Design a protein around this nucleic acid. Structure first.
Lengths: 98, 91
DNA sequence: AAATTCGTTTGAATTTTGAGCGAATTT
DNA sequence: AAATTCGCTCAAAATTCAAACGAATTT
């Protein structure tokens, strides 16, 4: 009765395929494509912040949406994100979303 | 100005970049829509796992398996990296 | 009014980090 | 032959955390 939903098909993105059909592909693939395009435009420059770089780019929308979802309620937001309320307040401050 | 972007196509077959954060936002809007007041519980680990794996995979490819250079690129500790690789069983 | 949330401290648990080391590997 | 990396430890620096609690909001 319940079809298996793989973890990679939980957060998905609309894409267009070779037959102009709209399909959901994992968010993973978005991250992969972003990184591949990032690496290609390096041309051998040295990197030292890739994790923080990727992390900000992902934390900001996550907080944005979860704050919209809870209608500004930091306690619920912290509770559905699975992090301490203080950690959440910290992150929100970090991205000027307070 | 945006270092992390993905490729989009519009109805006129024009390709265009968009910030990765738009993808993340879309995926989440879809997630929240699909569940109807069901409880979300560990959304941060959820998203974080969805992002750490392709990151590790791409940086390990770029450095041809060299964990030390990977860790240096990412700006994390080599131990932290080994740990994360263990976590997603890619070692 | 009642409850919930906010805003903040405080100290404990957990995690990340650096540094050091011989073994194994790459150059 | 050398240099680099790995695999692994120790402990200390940093971060996350669960509690508080009154003030401030919301229900």
């Amino acid at each position: 009765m319940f079809e298996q939903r793989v973890n990679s098909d939980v957060l998905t993105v609309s894409t267009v395929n070779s037959q102009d059909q709209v399909t959901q592909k994992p968010l993973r693939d978005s991250v992969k494509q972003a990184l591949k395009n990032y690496f290609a435009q390096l041309n051998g420059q040295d990197v030292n912040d890739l994790y923080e770089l990727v992390l900000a780019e992902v934390e900001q929308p996550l907080l944005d949406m979860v704050m919209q979802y809870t209608r500004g309620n930091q306690t619920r937001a912290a509770l559905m994100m699975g992090i301490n309320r203080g950690t959440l307040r910290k992150k929100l401050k970090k991205y000027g979303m307070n």
